[PDB]
Amino acid sequence: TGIIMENVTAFWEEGFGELLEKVSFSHLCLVGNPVLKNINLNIEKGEMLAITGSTGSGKTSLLMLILGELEASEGIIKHSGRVSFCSQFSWIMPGTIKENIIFGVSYDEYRYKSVVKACQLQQDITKFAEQDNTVLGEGGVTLSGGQRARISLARAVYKDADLYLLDSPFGYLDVFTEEQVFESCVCKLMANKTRILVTSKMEHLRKADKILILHQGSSYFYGTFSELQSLRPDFSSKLMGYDTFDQFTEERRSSILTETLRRFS
């Protein structure tokens, strides 16, 4: 499916804050304040939307909007079909690595092996005596953050859906593995799946079909990467003006983005 939002505004409603947490709110609800205002986007079947912004700009909230956990108080949103969501929090259920990737869905060999390879999990499971039959306890607590995120990503990607929402999978230290995953999974394997990737890496905007930048629940820019360079030259020159920005930590990339957005409103 494709996805369209026309002039969407979404207000803080009671309970939304806890849901964001479970991944003062009552004041935000009493004062009737938007979490997202005048959002517009039009994404074709098979296209990739890259979403970035300052920290706390509404990136996750926009996903919740697509999931229907947040109501569109004004404006129009259209998409059809199953959506698959990979959250910032990487949840792990009791069971093997395989059982986690396949959770609640039926096993298919070609599909599984293909997902496992593209999410770069082979490098991980090969370190284990029982490979992907290795048993994890909930939280998969002795794994690395990147290992948990790749399992969590594989699970969401293995879901058969029309639209994939990937909230910040690529935020950890093993930064070269992340580059392979983005190339192999998001760009190749899912090349023809409609997908939305929340991200603080510039390569992802550069390879994206559409770009949405958020600041203060507002749309700072929407368009192509070419239009971002010409229509937002201050932002672009500053961020493309590092040599290896994407290999900074997620905290640094995010705070640079925040400062640059604060600067050039």
Ligand X SMILES: Nc1ncnc2c1ncn2[C@@H]1O[C@H](COP(=O)(O)OP(=O)(O)NP(=O)(O)O)[C@@H](O)[C@H]1O
Which residues contact ligand X by CB under 6 A?
Answer: 20-21, 35, 53, 55-61
Nearer to ligand X, 184 or 258 (CB): 258
- Any alpha helices (H) in the chain, and if so which ranges? 16-22, 25-30, 59-67, 97-101, 109-118, 122-125, 145-158, 175-181, 202-206, 225-231, 233-239, 250-263
Task: Please report whether residue 200 would count as binding Mg ion according to CB under 5 A.
Answer: no
Chain position carrying tokens 């599909």: 111
Task: Please report whether residue 57 would count as binding Mg ion according to CB under 5 A.
Answer: no
53 is in an annotated binding site: yes
12 is in an annotated binding site: yes
2 is in an annotated binding site: no
Nearer to Mg ion, 86 or 118 (CB): 86
SS3 sequence of 203-235: HHHHCCCEEEEEECCEEEEEECHHHHHHHCHHH
57 is in an annotated binding site: yes
10 Å CB burial of residue 218 (0-12, 13-18, 19+) is middle
Task: Please report whether residue 100 would count as binding Mg ion according to CB under 5 A.
Answer: no
CB 120 to Mg ion: min, Å: 23
Question: Of Mg ion, ligand X, none, which one does residue 61 interact with (CB within 5 to 8 Å by kind)?
Answer: ligand X
Nearer to ligand X, 89 or 128 (CB): 89
Q: What angle do CA 226, 188, 158 make, to 5 degrees?
A: 125
Residue with the CB atom nearest Mg ion in the bound state: 60
Chain center to CA of 245: 19
56 is in an annotated binding site: yes
Question: Of ligand X, Mg ion, none, which one does residue 57 interact with (CB within 5 to 8 Å by kind)?
Answer: ligand X
Nearer to Mg ion, 59 or 193 (CB): 59
The Cβ of residue 219 has, within 10 Å, a number of other Cβ atoms equal to 21
Residues that bind Mg ion in the complex, under the rule CB under 5 A = 59-60
**Residues placed in the known binding site for ATP:** 12, 53-60, 88
